[PDB]
Design a protein around this ligand. Structure first.
Ligand SMILES: CCCc1cc(-c2nc(-c3ccc(C(=O)NCCC(F)(F)F)cc3)cs2)ccn1
Ligand SMILES: CCCc1cc(-c2nc(-c3ccc(C(=O)NCCC(F)(F)F)cc3)cs2)ccn1
Lengths: 191, 191
């Protein structure tokens, strides 16, 4: 409530400047509370970013779980596109949290562990689907599925986030989903 | 000379701890010089890391130029393996400089611009070879070559460096070259 106001203030300010340049007083002020009232809800501004990242990561995770439970009736290319799109739309809808959360992996063990935990879960699910595709005779047994999954997930992390940040170099945001789908489909189904 | 001693000291200390935990006095002490003598050679410890990274990046760049000028007599898979191997061996021989240099992209515009400049050069060369392969009828015209090149180069940056750092998740270092070659060959030659 005042908690949701603090989180919304932080996400808004992170569009303008880095967490380094945002004070607890900036977050309190934005949320219409005092500094000590802020400390009732969060121990630090770093905790606010951790909560924002945790919400975005869990949103992507629950969207991927929804696909898993409600698979689309489409070809393998459109299937992998639907999965990559969960990450494109979820993180691409929260670019300031994505940028700040990735930067915080350097300084926060809690942010690093959160990111690590979910990447392990997403890679494990990727590998499980590749193994299912191999089991049904649709994909060839080339690389170990978990190693292939790891590299494809790490490609998407770096490529999606470079695109969102407009880094030089980056794939244009309007081309990045097609670019990643090509590489996933050719590497998963290619001999 | 005393310059090479400062650089060798810094590369040695970076194996033990982050640049944050290395003082100018630590570098002077290691190089057998005083603090003011250090400032005769480098303006800051940040400049020392920039020079170390610049040397490693130029080593990889000159190795790739050597391949370009002395192409191996081998199949397309072993050809791309030779190119990725330049980065695997060069950066993998300097893991502390690689780790510290990547971390410094966050805080140093000079490190960020150096990294950006060379990634643009490597992606441009990748695209040029893919276009040559398309021109000779060996590769199909699928994605725009520069967009495919960008994503493959960014995959290698994230995947090689996660492997060297032993991040969770990462591909084991002994498996990462085969993993990347698979994805490059299938995505460049795959319909
Ligand atoms: C089988 C029927 C249900 C189903 C499953 C999928 C799957 N997609 C993925 C996946 C995982 C991670 C990514 C991914 O982008 N990681 C990187 C995450 C980031 F945060 F770093 F970007 C993409 C797809 C894994 S299974 C797609 C469609 N339908
Ligand atoms: C045509 C005959 C000469 C030739 C050329 C190649 C080429 N290889 C690459 C390349 C570029 C970047 C990478 C790469 O790993 N980037 C990422 C760099 C990093 F620093 F981030 F890791 C790999 C291969 C580009 S052309 C290979 C063999 N023989």
């Amino acid at each position: 409530d005042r908690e949701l106001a603090i989180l919304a203030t932080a996400e808004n300010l992170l569009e303008d400047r880095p967490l380094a340049d945002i004070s607890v007083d900036d977050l309190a002020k934005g949320a219409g509370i005092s500094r000590p009232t802020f400390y009732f809800y969060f121990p630090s501004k770093e905790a606010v970013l951790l909560t924002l990242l945790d919400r975005v990561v869990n949103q992507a995770d629950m969207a991927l779980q929804t696909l898993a439970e409600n698979p689309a009736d489409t070809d393998r290319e459109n299937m992998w596109r639907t999965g990559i799109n969960v990450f494109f739309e979820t993180f691409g809808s929260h670019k300031a949290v994505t940028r700040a959360g990735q930067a915080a992996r350097a300084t926060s063990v809690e942010v690093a562990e959160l990111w690590s935990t979910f990447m392990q879960k997403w890679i494990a699910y990727t590998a499980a689907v590749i193994d299912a595709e191999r089991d049904r005779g649709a994909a060839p047994r080339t690389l170990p599925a978990h190693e292939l999954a790891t590299a494809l997930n790490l490609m998407n992390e770096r490529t999606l986030f470079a695109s969102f940040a407009g880094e030089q170099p980056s794939v244009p945001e309007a081309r990045v989903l097609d670019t990643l789908v090509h590489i996933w489909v050719t590497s998963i189904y290619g001999e």
